[PDB]
Amino acid sequence: KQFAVIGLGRFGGSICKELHRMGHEVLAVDINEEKVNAYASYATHAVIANATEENELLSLGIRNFEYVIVAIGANIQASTLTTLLLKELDIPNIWVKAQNYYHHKVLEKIGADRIIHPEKDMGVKIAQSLSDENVLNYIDLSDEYSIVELLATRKLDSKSIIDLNVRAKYGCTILAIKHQDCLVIMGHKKDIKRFENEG
Amino acid sequence: KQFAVIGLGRFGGSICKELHRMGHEVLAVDINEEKVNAYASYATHAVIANATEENELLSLGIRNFEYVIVAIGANIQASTLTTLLLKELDIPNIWVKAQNYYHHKVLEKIGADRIIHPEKDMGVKIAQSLSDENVLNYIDLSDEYSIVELLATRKLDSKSIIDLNVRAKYGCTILAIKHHGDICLSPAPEDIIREQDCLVIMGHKKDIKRFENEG
Amino acid sequence: KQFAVIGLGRFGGSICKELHRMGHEVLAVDINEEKVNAYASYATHAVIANATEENELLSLGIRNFEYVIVAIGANIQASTLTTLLLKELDIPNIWVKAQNYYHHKVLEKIGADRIIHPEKDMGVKIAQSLSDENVLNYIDLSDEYSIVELLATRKSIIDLNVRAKYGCTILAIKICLSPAPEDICLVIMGHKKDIKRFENEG
Amino acid sequence: KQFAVIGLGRFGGSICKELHRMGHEVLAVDINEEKVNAYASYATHAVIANATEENELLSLGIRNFEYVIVAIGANIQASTLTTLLLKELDIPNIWVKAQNYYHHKVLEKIGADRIIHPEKDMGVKIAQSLSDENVLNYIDLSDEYSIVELLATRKLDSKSIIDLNVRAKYGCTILAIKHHGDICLSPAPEDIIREQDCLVIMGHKKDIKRFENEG
Amino acid sequence: KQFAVIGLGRFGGSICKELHRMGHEVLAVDINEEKVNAYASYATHAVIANATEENELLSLGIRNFEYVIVAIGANIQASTLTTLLLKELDIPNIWVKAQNYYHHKVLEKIGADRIIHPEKDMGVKIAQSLSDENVLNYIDLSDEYSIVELLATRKLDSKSIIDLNVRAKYGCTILAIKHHGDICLSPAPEDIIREQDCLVIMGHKKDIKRFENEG
Numbered sequence A: 001k002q003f004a005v006i007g008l009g010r011f012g013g014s015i016c017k018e019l020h021r022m023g024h025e026v027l028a029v030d031i032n033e034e035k036v037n038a039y040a041s042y043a044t045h046a047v048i049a050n051a052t053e054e055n056e057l058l059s060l061g062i063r064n065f066e067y068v069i070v071a072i073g074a075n076i077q078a079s080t081l082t083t084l085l086l087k088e089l090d091i092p093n094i095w096v097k098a099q100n101y102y103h104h105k106v107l108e109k110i111g112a113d114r115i116i117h118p119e120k121d122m123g124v125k126i127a128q129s130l131s132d133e134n135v136l137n138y139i140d141l142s143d144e145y146s147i148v149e150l151l152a153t154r155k156l157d158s159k160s161i162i163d164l165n166v167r168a169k170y171g172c173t174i175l176a177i178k179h180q181d182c183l184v185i186m187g188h189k190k191d192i193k194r195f196e197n198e199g
Numbered sequence B, D, E: 001k002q003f004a005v006i007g008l009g010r011f012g013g014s015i016c017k018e019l020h021r022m023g024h025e026v027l028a029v030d031i032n033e034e035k036v037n038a039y040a041s042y043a044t045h046a047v048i049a050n051a052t053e054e055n056e057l058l059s060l061g062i063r064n065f066e067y068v069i070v071a072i073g074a075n076i077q078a079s080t081l082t083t084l085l086l087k088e089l090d091i092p093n094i095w096v097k098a099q100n101y102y103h104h105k106v107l108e109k110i111g112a113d114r115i116i117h118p119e120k121d122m123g124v125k126i127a128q129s130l131s132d133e134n135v136l137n138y139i140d141l142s143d144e145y146s147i148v149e150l151l152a153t154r155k156l157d158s159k160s161i162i163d164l165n166v167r168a169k170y171g172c173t174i175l176a177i178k179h180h181g182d183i184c185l186s187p188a189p190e191d192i193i194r195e196q197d198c199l200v201i202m203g204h205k206k207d208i209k210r211f212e213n214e215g
Numbered sequence C: 001k002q003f004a005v006i007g008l009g010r011f012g013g014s015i016c017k018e019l020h021r022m023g024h025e026v027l028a029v030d031i032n033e034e035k036v037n038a039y040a041s042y043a044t045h046a047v048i049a050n051a052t053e054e055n056e057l058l059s060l061g062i063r064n065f066e067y068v069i070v071a072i073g074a075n076i077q078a079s080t081l082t083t084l085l086l087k088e089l090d091i092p093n094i095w096v097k098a099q100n101y102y103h104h105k106v107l108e109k110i111g112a113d114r115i116i117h118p119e120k121d122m123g124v125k126i127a128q129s130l131s132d133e134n135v136l137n138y139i140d141l142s143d144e145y146s147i148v149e150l151l152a153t154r155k156s157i158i159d160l161n162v163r164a165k166y167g168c169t170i171l172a173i174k175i176c177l178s179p180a181p182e183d184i185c186l187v188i189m190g191h192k193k194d195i196k197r198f199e200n201e202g
């Protein structure tokens, strides 16, 4: 697979370094000369180009890339003009980083295959950890069930699994323990909060 | 639990909106008047202040907040000077949003309780989804064992759980399966996996990768 | 009929002044303070607002306007964001001034009812006048047939065999409408190729 | 001894010229092309570089220098990220020119071996000369003891050393007398004090104030 | 004694904070609104005025000040036009902070009473500390004689004053010893010197250098 990442910011620069670490052909495009020089070593091909121009986009052979990631999320004009061109060039998969709710609505009309909010998805994830310090990481299977990696408190010390009645009393299934030790649990959103309060 | 969020960007503004939804007293501090007027309705109180000033920081009653989040990740001077003042004010928890690796090193020195890379962590998470399109959302329990929410392929249709030897060969456990928008926790042998449905699995990282090829 | 004109430039300010002359209520919105003060006298209601904000758009009572004209044609971000709000606010008629081909393609996606190129339409109209210095002003009824207002050069109507030889009809003589044989700006209606032959031979 | 001076301002450019005058190997680093061309004659080697970037720091050959002076004192971000790289490069002695009190607090955290306030230390010395027109130059041995180079008034003219009972009444010992451009180290009783000759007098900080007032 | 400080920089702001600490009436004039608000508490009278204007300078009542310090050292146009006005208004004492050699020459022509180089005089003083790590502070009595506040080494540990033939061989006099936060004036034979204590010495400039190499 060949990937193109347009815009080497904090978000796009992470995708170039990660996909290059896994051993993939990454094209790194950025309008900034100093950004491309820094990520020149972290990409298979790095070009100092403006992606809002169709002539520059055809010069890169952008039609040969199955996945194009437009990591521009502070310039709505540059981001929407780029993903309109890539939809014109018949790119199978265009993934765009959005800025606000209105930028999400423009890109949904002009044909973005997946629209990503990196700071909004992390900020909600961080604020869940701020509100309840017991949690460390979670994944939402649905809107009401989650796999919350809880942190064992002082009252859970020296307590066996059979002593815990999470299976029946709370209806929560413990998955793993990482030796205060990390306690991975699964259950309803309201049911897990009962186990956090009562230990 | 009273939270102060300094800098209402895409990251700071999301924490103010999320914590206000959960019903928490959030103080929204920003130096830009237009940003403050946007988050007046999404915060308990929104004020205009330059957090690099100690006199302006004490005019907010910032010593009364258990958590302060400095969500400035494009100005290193503004971000590092702010957490220095909060470190002096004996704030128990200071969480800072970092910009690069060398910005993370400054905050570690001057006493940031937690340092957050929002785009770097999401960019790494996205890049796993580009590389392996089977996955939908993964959470790393450790460096070798992870929970991967997989998407069922075309050959997984009309297949039973006992047919898939995940417990025996791959050494992985299917923790949940969802079909048609309804999620079933801890499926029992045997259940029908459909053409396009999410398949949550748990196991070693290299063991799931072998299973995705043969799924 | 209540009209809203968003963006007081050369194009938007001309729509405000013409509609205020005709006796219509016009709301003039612009982000520039100097523009609004100049067109405060030429608009029924004038405000200094950013039209890309949904809160500022609702303060104007923009839902009461049947026609909104987004005459922003150099800021693509301001033009595309504004028409998405007005589409969200259910304006029956949104007319947008575009900049280039790609700006036109964006506004077609997000639901612009009519997209206007003022400089491109005039530039095509002007460039037809430079190549053929006899013409003055023309409109295209169709691709093949057009009404061309020629300039009279160095004869009776019957002498000008446009009806038989060229297959064209003389429409006016400049003031005297509906000419008839015979009579010694010349308006001629006919096929586009036929008028060019008439100009070369006459 | 090898020295590197990062930032050729009024303060950094003075260290380059004084160390080169003494015959030391000075590397002059700056980001401005005009500054580097100006100090080509006053430094062993002058390089155009941006010190906040670590790749440009290792090209200079910065690990070969025992002393590095970061004489940037108007950009807090550029100064603190430079001394972070040098501290990470195991540079033994890093001397940093600071700007304000909060900049001093950051450099203390991230490992600056010595933090310098050139204008603040000179402003304090000047304000002692404005407040007291008798003094010319002083050195604080401690917070209560000092050596003050006084200036002779009219009442000290034609006065011998033994006539002045400074040793008993004030408890201050006269160290030297700058006689008409010629010094006199440890003057012996008695030497005639002229109209205007410097009187290097050592004593308590409060006691010399009495000597200035009582003449 | 009323002092006017024109330009509240790092150097001008240090004179305001020190003259007010000593109990003097200070007029703090600056063209920047942010600077005046910060120093409004540390100055008797703080004004946001431009000093290059003759009308604004007479609104301050600047003729009532014996000392005016023009602490603008990065703006030659503002510094030379200010002191041209103050000399035109017959200020008895005008002290100007200069930038380079050419600014020093202009201010001499247009009648500056004392011209100050804060960063240049510190850079020369700092470069002496980099060259010789034994010195901590020194005061130049002349171009050939100096008082150096040395630092004790391992070879100077447990050595009495009479053991050091500084009076006979080196021709230098030991003035005081800073014994770990305690300072003793005019030591008598004999006093023991610890491992690391400041040793204030006086002598010829070349004779002190021979002492450090030979002891």
Ligand SMILES: Nc1ncnc2c1ncn2[C@@H]1O[C@H](COP(=O)(O)OP(=O)(O)OP(=O)(O)O)[C@@H](O)[C@H]1O
Pocket: A006, A007, A008, A009, A010, A011, A012, A029, A030, A031, A032, A035, A049, A050, A051, A052, A071, A072, A073, A074, A075, A078, B119
């Ligand atoms: N037209 C363009 N074509 C290509 N790259 C561009 C273009 N416009 C901007 N960029 C580059 O894209 C990069 C990321 O965009 P930008 O800084 O606007 O986004 P952002 O919202 O700040 O994202 P991040 O949080 O990842 O930094 C920048 O380095 C910028 O120079």
Ligand SMILES: Nc1ncnc2c1ncn2[C@@H]1O[C@H](COP(=O)(O)OP(=O)(O)OP(=O)(O)O)[C@@H](O)[C@H]1O
Pocket: A119, B006, B007, B008, B009, B010, B011, B012, B029, B030, B031, B032, B035, B049, B050, B051, B052, B071, B072, B073, B074, B075, B078
């Ligand atoms: N000194 C300051 N005090 C308070 N708020 C500030 C200060 N400096 C910047 N801000 C605000 O912080 C917010 C976010 O800062 P900035 O835009 O520099 O960071 P970012 O990392 O690019 O943003 P984001 O969180 O959107 O990714 C902005 O609204 C900005 O106005």
Ligand SMILES: Nc1ncnc2c1ncn2[C@@H]1O[C@H](COP(=O)(O)OP(=O)(O)OP(=O)(O)O)[C@@H](O)[C@H]1O
Pocket: C006, C007, C008, C009, C010, C011, C012, C029, C030, C031, C032, C035, C049, C050, C051, C052, C071, C072, C073, C074, C075, C078
């Ligand atoms: N967000 C906005 N909301 C309202 N008015 C705006 C906005 N952005 C720009 N304007 C105003 O719209 C007017 C026209 O926009 P602009 O000058 O960018 O377009 P243009 O193509 O040059 O227009 P014209 O050819 O009519 O002069 C200007 O007066 C500008 O100040």
Ligand SMILES: Nc1ncnc2c1ncn2[C@@H]1O[C@H](COP(=O)(O)OP(=O)(O)OP(=O)(O)O)[C@@H](O)[C@H]1O
Pocket: D006, D007, D008, D009, D010, D011, D012, D029, D030, D031, D032, D035, D049, D050, D051, D052, D071, D072, D073, D074, D075, D078, E119
């Ligand atoms: N990142 C950098 N790397 C190297 N040199 C730099 C860098 N940033 C600034 N400089 C240079 O450092 C020199 C001094 O810095 P600056 O002028 O900001 O400090 P300052 O406190 O005003 O100094 P001074 O008052 O002694 O002149 C300038 O010549 C400037 O060009």
Ligand SMILES: Nc1ncnc2c1ncn2[C@@H]1O[C@H](COP(=O)(O)OP(=O)(O)OP(=O)(O)O)[C@@H](O)[C@H]1O
Pocket: D119, E006, E007, E008, E009, E010, E011, E012, E029, E030, E031, E032, E035, E049, E050, E051, E052, E071, E072, E073, E074, E075, E078
């Ligand atoms: N014409 C003026 N009148 C009054 N104040 C002025 C004028 N011009 C500049 N200043 C102020 O004087 C102060 C010092 O000026 P400047 O920054 O040019 O000098 P500097 O040599 O860099 O100062 P320092 O090294 O002491 O920080 C600043 O606060 C500046 O705003």
Ligand code: NA
Pocket: A010, A119, B010, B119
């Ligand atoms: Na961002």
Ligand code: NA
Pocket: C010, C119
């Ligand atoms: Na135009």
Ligand code: NA
Pocket: D010, D119, E010, E119
């Ligand atoms: Na300075």
